[PDB]
Amino acid sequence: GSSGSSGHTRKRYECSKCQATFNLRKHLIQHQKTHAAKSGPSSG
Ligand SMILES: [Zn+2]
């Protein structure tokens, strides 16, 4: 339909931490909270 390439994004929001998909934008915002695992290779 004479569409324009400009625009490479999915209709859903993916998580670059657990590879999970979400429907609501705000839903992912909070989900990312549990992904606040600051690098800690020196943790017993
Ligand atoms: Zn995630």
Describe the model.
The PDB classes it as transcription. Keywords: zf-C2H2, Structural Genomics, nppsfa, National Project on Protein Structural and Functional Analyses, RIKEN Structural Genomics/Proteomics Initiative, rsgi, transcription. The assembly is monomeric. Solution structure of the C2H2 type zinc finger (region 342-372) of human Zinc finger protein 473. This protein is an alpha+beta fold and 44 residues long. It has a single domain (11-44), classed as 2-Layer Sandwich (Double Stranded RNA Binding Domain), CATH 3.30.160.60. The chain has 1 helix and 2 strands; from the N terminus they run ββα. A two-stranded antiparallel sheet has the order 1-2. The protein is elongated, with a radius of gyration of 16 Å. The structure holds zinc ion. Zinc ion (ZN) is lined by residues 15, 17-18, 20, 31, 35.
Tags for this entry?
44 residues, alpha+beta, Double Stranded RNA Binding Domain, two-stranded antiparallel ribbon, 1 helix, 16% helix, elongated, binds zinc ion, Zinc finger protein 473
Task: Describe the secondary structure blueprint for this structure.
Elements lengths: L12 E2 L6 E2 L2 H7 L13
Antiparallel strand pairs: 1-2
The structure holds zinc ion.
